[PDB]
Amino acid sequence: TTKESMGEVMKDSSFALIEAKYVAGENIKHIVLENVQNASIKVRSRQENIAGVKIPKFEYFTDGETKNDLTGLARGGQQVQQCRAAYVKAIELLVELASLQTSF
Amino acid sequence: SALIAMIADEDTVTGFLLAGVGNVDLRRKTNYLIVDSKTTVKAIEDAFKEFTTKEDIAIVLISQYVANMIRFLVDSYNKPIPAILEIPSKDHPYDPAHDSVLSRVKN
Amino acid sequence: AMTFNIHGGYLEAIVRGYRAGLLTIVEKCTLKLVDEYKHMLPLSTFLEYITYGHMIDNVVLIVTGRDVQELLEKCHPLGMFDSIMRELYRLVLVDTPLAPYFSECITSEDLDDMNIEIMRNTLYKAYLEDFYKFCQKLGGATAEIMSDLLAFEADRRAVNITINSIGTELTRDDRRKLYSLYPYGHEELAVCEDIDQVRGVMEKYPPYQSIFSKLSYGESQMLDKAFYEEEVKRLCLAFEQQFHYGVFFAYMRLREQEIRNLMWISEC
């Protein structure tokens, strides 16, 4: 299911970049790089024993602790709705991938 | 904890790096910036084996597996938690090939 | 209008021809426009004010602090003026009228020019100083168009403030001051504290009104995208191309709009 969501996640994400180009044109680039209104890169994962096997619950950004946001840019809302949603999908993707590898 | 790509299409990575804080998973303070295509992304696999595996950053990112040069990280399928990544499009549609976790996920 | 016939006819004709000629890729187009302006180097003052705004952008990029020199080089040399941190902002203040106001707004230099919210206020002050430099053209129809554009920018800044920068804790009086004759007074859009309530008041502004229309994209957006349709309209104002006046800044704006359209087209 997460893989099916993948790819469509990037297709949705590209709309945020198009909106940023339309509204604010070029990004801040360099260290700032702009284009981010939410989904700060902070996560929280823990190995959990399921069926006698420890399974890391890899919760990444948009689903991990200490996530932060800084208002909204011209396309910051589009980035949050597109790029940050991709992070939420990727959290489950990583957790499921680790669990599946360990279980296999 | 965090997730450091340090190489990708960087289009969605910059927007997903950081907005308010968290140091963009220390990709700016440490490791490398999410921007890529300037050099070989085999160094990205080396950093993932070094920096991501150092417990600071859980995951990584590579785009389309075509120019991602992720065949060096093919052995990174073992220990999925230190090295877990899925190829997005980010204007470079994913192409199934030997990568960090692509072969294991597809199988 | 006999003054154009008496003197300055050749430069005005060359500028008009350059304007009519133009109807990554965006960076290349901006560099070509900068090269054309350099080859060319009244309407000259207006073009200088437009370049002053485009250099306020590059200075705010440079006043902060990451390959900053490479980023400035990637920009057009008109935007990245060769003549041109607290020391960086102070140096930018020389030869650029727009920079010192940005330095004044950014009391902590790069820290008070953070790209999240603070750089918005710094660039707003820089644009205010650039508008003062444009007003230093002793008025005119082009000055009226510049004042309308500045009012649109101030309304967009106030709308974006009430929309998102309230969380950034920008003071309502300060944000109104941050959002900039016409740009100076925008109490109607600042009366409503609520984002939804203030969006209607900002759209009620004459620059925003009759251009944004539904404004599915635009007034809803933050930063300075509220008057995006009004910017295209002001570009269409240059499409009139009335002669015997100063339209070099209009020519530069049209070239920039063409570059932006080419960038938006991108592949196919």
The DSSP annotation for C35-56 comes to HHHHHH--HHHHHHHHHHHHHH
Contact B19 A38 (CB under 8 A): yes
Q: How far apart are the first and last CA of chain B?
A: 28
Looking at beta carbons, which pairs linking C191-197 to residues 24 or more positions away fall under 8 Å?
Answer: C192/C162, C193/C162, C193/C166, C194/C162, C195/C162, C195/C163, C195/C164, C195/C166
DSSP-assigned beta bridge partners for residue A53: A50
**Residue B33 to residue B5: CA distance in whole angstroms:** 8
- Chain A contacts of B81, Cβ < 8 Å? 45, 56, 58, 98
Helix or strand holding residue A45 (H, E): strand A44-50
**Residue C180 to residue C163: CA distance in whole angstroms:** 17
CA distances from A32 to A2, B33, B96, C41, C207 (A): 31, 11, 32, 34, 31
* Expt. technique: cryo-EM
**Closest CA–CA distance from residue B99 to any residue of chain A (Å):** 14
Question: Could you say which of A18, A24, A32 has the minimum Cβ distance to residue C223?
Answer: A24
Breaks (C-N over 2.5 A) in chain A follow: none
- Chain C contacts of A37, Cβ < 8 Å? 164
Comparing C-alpha atoms, which of A84, A54, A41 is closest to residue B81?
A: A54
**Residue A57 to residue C93: CA distance in whole angstroms:** 53
**Least CA distance to B35: which residue of chain A?**
A30
Taking the CA of residue C254 as centre, how many other CA atoms within 13 Å lie in the half-sphere pointing to its CB?
A: 20
Contact B17 A17 (CB under 8 A): no
**Residue A65 to residue C157: CA distance in whole angstroms:** 33
- Chain A contacts of C265, Cβ < 8 Å? none
**What resolution in Å is listed for this PDB structure?**
4.2
**Residue B72 to residue A92: CA distance in whole angstroms:** 25
**Residue C76 to residue B39: CA distance in whole angstroms:** 25
Question: Could you say which of B3, B15, B105 has the minimum Cβ distance to residue A97?
Answer: B105
Residue to substitute from C27, C223, C261, C266, interface A, most A β-carbons within 10 A: C223
